[PDB]
Amino acid sequence: ILGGREAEAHARPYMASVQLNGAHLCGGVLVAEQWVLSAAHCLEDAADGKVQVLLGAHSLSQPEPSKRLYDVLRAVPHPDSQPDTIDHDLLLLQLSEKATLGPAVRPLPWQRVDRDVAPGTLCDVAGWGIVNHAGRRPDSLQHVLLPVLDRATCNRRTHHDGAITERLMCAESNRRDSCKGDSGGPLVCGGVLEGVVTSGSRVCGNRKKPGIYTRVASYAAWIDSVLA
Length: 228
Fold this sequence. Notes:
Its EC number is 3.4.21.46. With 228 residues, the protein is mainly beta. It has helices at 151-155, 220-227, and strands at residues 5-6, 15-20, 23-32, 35-38, 51-55, 68-77, 91-95, 122-127, 142-149, 168-171, 186-189, 192-197, 211-215.
């Protein structure tokens, strides 16, 4: 997160950290007791290595009572995802066991109605991704509220030149943005999960390159079927 603040400890119980060999890789969001939703291209990095997910955390290095590392039983990437595109960039991870729920660990309701967030709406994004251009990585959870951008504006040649399909949404990226390491994370609007931070190479904080997020409502059928 760029231009953001530190998040209130354990105020987003659904926040997950997807890890590769004890190191944070991407963000993730608990959507069910045994399922965490993230981005597919995150596994492209975990080619060689063990994938685990950390729940109930705030600081990635310090001991916390609610902290728990879960192993991954299976990783289900969306079937139409390609290692060379930003479409269907979702991944579902089944934890080795159901997550122990508490005030610091709880699933987040997600959007099933396929309706665009009104533009200007402020949504919350969080992650342990880099905080500046030097590539600095926070130890604790960061976040930032970002306004949603109408699609027509995100599509202009000056922005993402019609790369935005109905299955994607954008939020402003001026000084405040999600960056590397935040991929796979939550974009919450009105207490509900509206999107997931995509996992593609993109410059951060440049208002001419809005943040791209995958709309979960557009994938309600795939999720329902994977969690069935």
